[PDB]
Amino acid sequence: GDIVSEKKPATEVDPTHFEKRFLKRIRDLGEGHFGKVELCRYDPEGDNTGEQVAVKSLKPENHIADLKKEIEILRNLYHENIVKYKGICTEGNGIKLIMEFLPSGSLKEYLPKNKNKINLKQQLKYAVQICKGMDYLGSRQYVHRDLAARNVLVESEHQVKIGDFGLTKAIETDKEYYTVKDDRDSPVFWYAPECLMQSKFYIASDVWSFGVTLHELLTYCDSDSSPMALFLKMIGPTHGQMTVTRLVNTLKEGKRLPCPPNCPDEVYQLMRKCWEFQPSNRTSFQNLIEGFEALLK
């Protein structure tokens, strides 16, 4: 008789599924390590009225498994100071991470441009927000490993969010740290001594990175006062492959980044507590939250 076909089952729409054909590239936003982030418009109506989104894709060069792990981490993080997961675009092994777009960008471009409207009180409120997002990440047993002002996005003049989780790793249950094997592109000037010499990553190692991020915040991310520029002035700049060993020696000696210009000593002492040589001796994120809240009174 008649040709047999398939009964069409009801097709429910997934709001976290972004079709490639409607995901239109506007410009590059940033990049890091094996990935890149682009501003796109998701435009199913094809009239330029669609929502603007930030799209993470792998740089052509392996790392598919890392991007998929990052998607699964971000998809399950829900915090006011953590960039919002929106969905995915699937290829086919390929995948793209869809996040909310924050037009003000990172603190690295925002602070040098908005010094006049961002006073100490606002800088301390951003510090609290970063600590709150980080404490939430730590409570879910994750280490960020790339905490720097460059990875902090501006939602508005009054709110910041951790904007990238490209290097985020889980800590094991009944364990205290993550062991790194791939360290070639490490942001060494933001790293705790245990990360540089023993390749161990603790929640206390993220507290060290926060201390350096706080210093950047207080210097309005000025390029000439950057953690890299300051440490290279301290140890020497032209040392090539000997730079990390010279940095470790400097930290063992008790030397640290100086107090930023116009930064009060009470704020500098909270920053120094992030830089205790032993991780067990360092301040916690909750203690930092209470320290800043006390200065905001």
Ligand SMILES: N#CC[C@@H]([C@H]1CCN(c2cccc(Cl)c2C#N)C1)n1cc(-c2ncnc3[nH]ccc23)cn1
């Ligand atoms: N945060 C941040 C800084 C960079 C990203 C860019 C990639 N990057 C990485 C870093 C390390 C490892 C890896 Cl694997 C990567 C990768 N990939 C950092 N950035 C994001 C925006 C941005 N701007 C507006 N809205 C946004 N919504 C989400 C993000 C976003 C602008 N610059």
